[PDB]
Design a protein around this ligand. Sequence first.
Ligand SMILES: [Ca+2]
Length: 89
Amino acid sequence: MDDIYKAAVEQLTEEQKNEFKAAFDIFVLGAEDGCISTKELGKVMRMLGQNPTPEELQEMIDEVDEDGSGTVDFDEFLVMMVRCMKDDS
Ligand SMILES: [Ca+2]
């Protein structure tokens, strides 16, 4: 975990986390603690306007997950987005 991605999540604009913060609450609307589970991620992205595959959902998530929790919180949830936004070198 270098200091490159950490800045990628902060570089986001205030309007980016403002609108996404709303949808995020839509996936946790069913969760028990208030987080977006990877199981619904597919439906979460399908309506968000994305087209993630079934093997990429958990894969990418389990890859960006650092607290070894399994659910995608605003912390890992954002890193998973900036990832598909900026990949490769
Ligand atoms: Ca996690």
